[PDB]
Amino acid sequence: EPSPYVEFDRRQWRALRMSTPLALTEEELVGLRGLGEQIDLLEVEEVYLPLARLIHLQVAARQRLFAATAEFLGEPQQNPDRPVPFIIGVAGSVAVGKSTTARVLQALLARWDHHPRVDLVTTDGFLYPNAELQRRNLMHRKGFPESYNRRALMRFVTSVKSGSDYACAPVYSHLHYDIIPGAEQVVRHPDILILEGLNVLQTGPTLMVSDLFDFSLYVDARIEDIEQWYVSRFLAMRTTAFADPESHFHHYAAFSDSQAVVAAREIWRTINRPNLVENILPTRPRATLVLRKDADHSINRLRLRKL
Amino acid sequence: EPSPYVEFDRRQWRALRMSTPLALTEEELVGLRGLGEQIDLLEVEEVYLPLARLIHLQVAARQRLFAATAEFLGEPQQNPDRPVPFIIGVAGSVAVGKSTTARVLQALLARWDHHPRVDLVTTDGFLYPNAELQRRNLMHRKGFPESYNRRALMRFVTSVKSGSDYACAPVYSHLHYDIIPGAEQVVRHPDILILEGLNVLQTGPTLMVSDLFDFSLYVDARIEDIEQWYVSRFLAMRTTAFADPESHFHHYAAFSDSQAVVAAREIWRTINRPNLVENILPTRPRATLVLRKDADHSINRLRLRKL
Ligand SMILES: Nc1nc2c(ncn2[C@@H]2O[C@H](COP(=O)(O)OP(=O)(O)O)[C@@H](O)[C@H]2O)c(=O)[nH]1
Ligand SMILES: Nc1nc2c(ncn2[C@@H]2O[C@H](COP(=O)(O)OP(=O)(O)O)[C@@H](O)[C@H]2O)c(=O)[nH]1
Ligand SMILES: CC(C)(CO)[C@@H](O)C(=O)NCCC(=O)O
Ligand SMILES: CC(C)(CO)[C@@H](O)C(=O)NCCC(=O)O
Ligand SMILES: [Cl-]
Ligand SMILES: [Cl-]
């Protein structure tokens, strides 16, 4: 059977690095990794460097495509000191490390010849604020598609990709468990916009951000592994984030290893797992590149969309 | 508000024809038009010629894109006497003339310099045969997504776009109201494959043919107009197709103008309208170009996806 995909292992994949230079310290890599993420320079070299290359091959090529439409429309030539922004989506479960992957990718990409403006946005700030979620009865469905202002989100990316000079996104605080009053992220005609979130590859009766991506990643792992990473990160946060008296989950700091495992399993069981099964995992087939991770967080397989 | 779309009227649109030669007789145009379709050489010149141009601009450009992936993968160069096939989808309601649009487009495209192999396939032959539909309780939902062998359909297009030498599709008879035993359409590594059907722009938990399109059309009209075209074509078929004694709807031949209007309204009311509202119309936002038709079948507006 022919297939739109081709599978790789890490051997096959690292060969595709070719000449691509590594522009990252261990000290710089440190500052990009999230709690519980195990990435080192080797993983960057073998996994993230081929990837960065592929994307650069595609930016050039995907531009020829918009130029072709603008030529058809008898339009101005388009100054190359502001092309049409390349949009990259990053998806996958809570606790799977989307965050680290997107920051690493941003950093690699910004160290290209152009020195291109590479911005990074998470869909967190497009959550409805708590008071609106309370209203909609969705305080226990944060992360589900309906807990987002999808329209506001779509307006943002559309705004950016259509060549606007600036666009604003709201800002989410994990510590305070809500949207931050008055806070804005300002994206100014970047060259590349990475958009990171659970459900960014969703599709629907209306045009959505997944329709605007020129390239997508889905970070994947076995569901039980991800649960383990999630529970595990929950116990760890008892001495990082939960330890803050301002933390909306400061009550959790005091929990025993065992009470905390019970709490975290319950959250997984009722929110994050159902969302992964029902909404996120069904988006995996569309992703340009799936990064498969083994129980130790290691990316050891990849699935590339050839078609 | 910025928009992924740009609207045209026919004036704006016909300007975009530029130099593009017209290679069609009135006698050739005649043989491509379906019962009730009103297209003339003027419509071809003003509407179909810009369109054909846009597509040619895109074929070149979309090839640069697959070449970029193959370059990344360190693959052979790809002989230009067989690139990766350009796939065009054509969608819209029953009775809206998808058929005519796709045949016209095929004909225009095959009269390009390459003299390219342009094949045309409708999703009709991917219906389940009656006996299987009876089984699934779907004899009154022909045309709904679930009345198709979607997997078989996906296998077909995947097969073609992945460079296979040949792929087979089954064949549907309207006259006999069923799949034709033993009949095959054989598509042999075309340059361009046009895939025409109601639901070809649908999207879902699995990778679908809409994910393989490099360009799509959606032929649109006001729903009441389409009903009128449908009822109207039904009365007309009383002396064309229904007149055949072999016709599965030969009983309809004898109906009065008025009994027939009642029959056709009922079919619209119970099958074709619900499907248009529930499944087809929700796919319009993704289409590259929507062709809007006025009550006289005339394309007078267009919506192009810029993003
Ligand atoms: N303060 C706080 N931070 C959290 C919590 N959960 C996640 N985060 C932070 O949010 C970031 C996003 O985590 P998550 O949504 O699971 O996405 P991931 O990047 O795919 O692991 C992580 O780097 C965590 O540091 C939490 O419960 N409290
Ligand atoms: N024999 C027969 N042909 C039909 C019937 N309905 C549609 N057709 C043919 O099927 C072709 C497809 O029609 P339709 O499915 O409405 O698609 P359209 O091309 O968008 O109008 C048309 O050209 C008709 O000639 C029918 O009831 N009997
Ligand atoms: C992606 C976010 C930031 C939002 O869902 C996720 O990490 C989160 O906040 N989850 C918490 C789910 C809950 O406890 O309401
Ligand atoms: C697209 C097809 C050919 C199949 O739905 C359509 O024109 C059709 O056959 N409609 C008939 C619906 C019905 O009477 O069962
Ligand atoms: Cl999301
Ligand atoms: Cl279909």
Our CA-based measurement puts residue B9 at a distance from the nearest CA of chain A, in whole angstroms, of 14
Residue among A95, A93, A102, A10 at smallest CA distance from A52: A102
Distance CA B228, CA B130 (A): 28
B1 contact A CB<8A: yes
Distance CA B3, CA B285 (A): 12
Residues in chain A within 8 Å Cβ distance of B207:
4, 285-286
Residues in chain B within 8 Å Cβ distance of A207:
4, 285-286
Our CA-based measurement puts residue B34 at a distance from the nearest CA of chain A, in whole angstroms, of 30
Distance CA A21, CA A109 (A): 11
B207 neighbors A286 (Cβ within 8 angstroms): yes
Residue with tokens 């993230």: A48
B200 CA from centroid of ligand 6 (Å): 4
**Cα–Cα distances in Å, from A12 out to A22, B60, B74?**
19, 30, 11
| CA A272 to ligand 3: nearest atom | 12
Residue by residue, DSSP assigns B81-125 as TS-PPEEEEEE--TTS-HHHHHHHHHHHHHTSTT---EEEEEGGG
> Using CB atoms within 10 A of its CB, is residue A306 exposed (0-12), middle (13-18) or buried (19+)?
middle
**Who's near A115: CB < 8 A, 6+ residues apart?**
none
**Cα–Cα distances in Å, from A66 out to A194, A224, A268?**
19, 42, 42
Query: In chain B, how many domains are there?
Result: 1
B88 neighbors B105 (Cβ within 8 angstroms): yes
Q: Which CATH number is A111's domain given?
A: 3.40.50.300
Distance CA B241, CA B244 (A): 6
Residue whose Cα lies nearest atom 5 of ligand 2: it is B174
B212 contact A CB<8A: yes
Distance CA A204, CA A195 (A): 18
Distance CA A306, CA A283 (A): 17
B240 contact A CB<8A: no
Residue among B300, B299, B174 at smallest CA distance from B233: B174
Pocket test for ligand 4, best of B35, B90, B94 (most atoms within 8 A of CB): B94
**Who's near B199: CB < 8 A, 6+ residues apart?**
B91, B123, B143, B144, B145, B148, B279, B280, B283
Distance CA B88, CA B196 (A): 8
Domain of residue A288, residue span:
1-307
Residues in chain A within 8 Å Cβ distance of B205:
282, 285
B244 neighbors B234 (Cβ within 8 angstroms): no
Q: What is the DSSP letter of A148?
A: B
Distance CA B289, CA B287 (A): 5
B164 neighbors B248 (Cβ within 8 angstroms): no
CB atoms A64 and B67 under 8 Å: no
Distance CA B105, CA A22 (A): 49
Residue among A227, A212, A204 at smallest CA distance from A283: A204
Q: Read off the amino acid at residue B209.
A: V
A141 neighbors A210 (Cβ within 8 angstroms): no
Residue among B63, B166, B81 at smallest CA distance from A2: B166
- Ligand 1 neighbour A98 (Cβ under 6 A): yes
**Cα–Cα distances in Å, from B123 out to A136, B168, B226?**
41, 13, 20
Experimental method of this PDB entry:
X-ray
Contacts A–B by Cβ distance under 8 A? 103
A282 contact B CB<8A: yes
Q: Which CB contacts under 8 angstroms, 24+ apart, belong to A104-109?
A: A104/A29, A104/A32, A104/A33, A104/A39, A104/A44, A104/A48, A105/A48, A105/A51, A105/A52, A105/A194, A105/A217, A106/A194, A107/A24, A107/A28, A107/A32, A108/A23, A108/A24, A108/A44, A108/A48, A108/A49, A108/A52, A109/A52, A109/A55, A109/A192
Mutation for A interface: B58, B63, B65, B206, most A CBs within 10 A: B65
Specified resolution (Å): 2.5
A76 contact B CB<8A: no
B159 contact A CB<8A: yes
Our CA-based measurement puts residue B90 at a distance from the nearest CA of chain A, in whole angstroms, of 18
B246 contact A CB<8A: no
Distance CA A85, CA B143 (A): 39
Distance CA A104, CA A157 (A): 21
CB atoms A4 and B211 under 8 Å: yes
A190 neighbors A119 (Cβ within 8 angstroms): yes
The values of phi and psi at residue A222, to 5°, are -60, 140
Chain B residue with minimal CA distance to A210? B286
Residue whose Cα lies nearest atom 7 of ligand 1: it is A174
Chain A residue with minimal CA distance to B67? A61
Distance CA A130, CA A109 (A): 35
B210 neighbors B143 (Cβ within 8 angstroms): no
- Measured from the Cβ of residue B39, the count of other Cβ atoms closer than 10 Å reads 21
Distance CA B122, CA B143 (A): 12
B273 CA from centroid of ligand 4 (Å): 12
Mutation for B interface: A14, A57, A66, most B CBs within 10 A: A57
| CA A197 to ligand 3: nearest atom | 1
